[PDB]
Design a protein around this nucleic acid. Structure first.
Length: 167
RNA sequence: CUGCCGUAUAGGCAG
């Protein structure tokens, strides 16, 4: 398993902004840092996740190799967001751990539009750079399993087939 | 929210 490193980022509490909004901004920032990085070997997970209350939790975990993680952190992608963040230290993941894939999940009038011309899940609220439309990006943490499969990750850090250690 | 792939009105994706 080559993605044996991680970094924990904690949202600092803030009366002005609820955790969900803070996490969304954080996630959006990670997204732009990922498209700048250009690869598909960096994943995420939300270790404090509350499946029952469809809440992502106060924590974002970044998964990558020691080198991919290092490069990612060299970038000024957390510019103007640091004061809202608490940083764990880049570390080798514990072992053993189960593995799971964290994926974006998607599910009438739009389906009617395209046709003519022819989700109880936690989420982040994002912003399409060009259109300016705001959309909810629903995230699912899949069933735990013993080993990790080969696979990559979206530029949002979501599973494109790849798994991340869960702990 | 908007679009894409697909006969789909199944199932997949993109911001």
């Amino acid at each position: 398993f080559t993605m044996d490193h991680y970094l924990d980022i904690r949202l600092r509490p803030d009366p002005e902004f609820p955790p969900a909004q803070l996490m969304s901004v954080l996630f959006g920032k990670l997204h732009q840092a990922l498209v700048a990085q250009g690869g598909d070997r960096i994943g995420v997970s939300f270790p404090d996740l509350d499946e029952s209350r469809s809440r992502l939790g106060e924590r974002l975990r970044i998964h990558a190799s020691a080198d991919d993680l290092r490069a990612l952190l060299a970038r000024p992608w957390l510019e103007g967001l640091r004061d809202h963040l608490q940083f764990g230290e880049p570390a080798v993941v514990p072992h053993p751990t189960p593995y799971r894939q964290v994926s974006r999940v998607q599910a009438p009038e739009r389906l009617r539009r395209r046709l003519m011309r022819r989700l109880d899940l936690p989420f982040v609220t994002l912003r399409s750079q060009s259109t300016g439309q705001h959309f909810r990006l629903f995230i699912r943490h899949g069933p735990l399993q013993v080993t990790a499969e080969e696979g990559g990750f979206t530029c949002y850090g979501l599973s494109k087939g790849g798994f991340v250690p869960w702990f």
